[PDB]
């Protein structure tokens, strides 16, 4: 499986700062054997894709489930490929549990994007109370439900699996847990696709991911990269690119 | 007499490509416009940087929504900050595709309106009721809750008839011009006449050629929101409805 890591800056972006991230990405000395993606706010995406060489992804950070109609503030796959971009990350834990989106809209974009050609990391993940409760599994596999459910084809999916107590919070998943969760949603794929999918697929770690603990998590057996929060803004991010090599 | 400025948003909605963005621009650039008509549109998020390199600054250009903090941990989200940062200076807020189908809350899209006009982002601010809030006779609690949630010099109100948008019946003038007085007393009351007085109220529901000169002619009617239309040469005379 090749190595994958993306930078999810969230709302973080102006002309300036996103110049200064492109100057990083393009003088970075980054492993060839690497796939590497960012993904700006939504104003920025066609200047970013501009700027940046096609070696890096530039991906959106959400978008809708048809190419058209009366969606005031939604952006579809069609707009996304219209102005160069063929990634998106859908399903956030901040998109579903702060601005509300169900398992159902999650899966809904996600087979529309497929349908459209645009690449999707679809996102699952529990949250504290609920890994206390021991529902991690069960929140991990009804997500992972929605997605698959109207789904046939997997080799445009990077799944990413944020812990949602370890989004922003500096708690990162212990190399042992995120082990573990990777290898269940694996076995989860073995089952419910097919096993030569589950051994493709890319599974790929979200949640306080430094520079300090990215070999780490990086080596392990299910874990095949990254989803970068807050550290894609910084020079760390190239030493995160780098943590399988 | 009333003297507000009349005003014209085209809404775009999720409508837009390369190329017919390109037609719409030049549609508006070679036009005969009122030139005392206020012209607003709203690409979408991806495209308001290019389509506002591309248009006159006679012409606004406005975010078809935003979020309540300059920046942070919010995928999928963009700030009024943003918005500057591009050269555009407005946004639309509450619509009621965001509150019934984005699930907005009254509260968020009050948190939302009061940051961007502290980054310096202008905004339409959208209300309205739908039909079982109308015909449960809430159709000022709606509007006057949704109001209060919010509560000038930079703020435009556009009043939705959601219960005829979502339903298929046709709103008629009468009925647009007694929601946008009573909206209007409303601000008389909880801000001041002053504010009343030159506040401009804006109609949202379906206003096409054929009506759009009609419901310009109500007293508390001070223009548009446009769904549909914004995309055909329709907009053109919706700019002229008011001359």
């Known amino acids: ?12 972006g102006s002309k300036k700062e996103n ?11 980054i492993d060839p054997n690497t796939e590497v993606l960012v993904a700006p706010p939504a104003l920025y995406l066609p200047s970013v894709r501009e700027k940046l060489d096609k070696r890096f992804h530039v991906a959106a950070q959400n978008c809708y489930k048809v190419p058209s109609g009366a969606f005031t503030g939604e952006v ?21 549990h702060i601005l509300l989106e169900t398992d159902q809209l999650v ?7 497929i349908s459209a050609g645009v690449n999707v990391i679809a996102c699952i993940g529990e949250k504290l109370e ?8 069960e929140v991990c596999f009804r997500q992972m439900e929605a997605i698959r459910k109207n789904l046939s084809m997997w080799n445009h999916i990077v799944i990413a699996y944020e812990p949602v107590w370890a989004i922003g919070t500096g708690k990162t998943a212990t190399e042992q847990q995120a082990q573990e969760v990777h290898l ?3 076995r989860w794929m073995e089952e419910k696709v097919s096993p030569a999918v589950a051994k493709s697929i890319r599974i790929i770690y979200g949640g306080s991911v430094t520079a300090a603990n990215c070999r780490t998590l990086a080596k392990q057996p299910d ?3 990254f989803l970068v929060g807050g550290a894609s803004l910084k020079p760390d991010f190239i030493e995160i690119c780098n943590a399988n090599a």
Not at 76 to 93: E, N, T
Not at 107 to 113: C, I, P, R, S, V
């Open 130 to 137: 609920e890994r206390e409760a021991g529902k991690t599994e």
């Open 76 to 96: 579809s796959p069609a707009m996304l490929k219209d102005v160069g971009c063929d990634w998106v990350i859908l399903g956030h834990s901040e998109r579903r």
């Open 223 to 225: 874990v095949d990269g």
């Open 184 to 186: 269940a949603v694996r």
């Open 107 to 113: 899966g809904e974009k996600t087979n529309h994007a």
């Open 19 to 29: 110049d200064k991230l492109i100057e990083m990405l393009t003088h970075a000395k």
């Open 1 to 12: 499986r090749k190595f994958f890591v993306g930078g999810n800056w969230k709302m973080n």
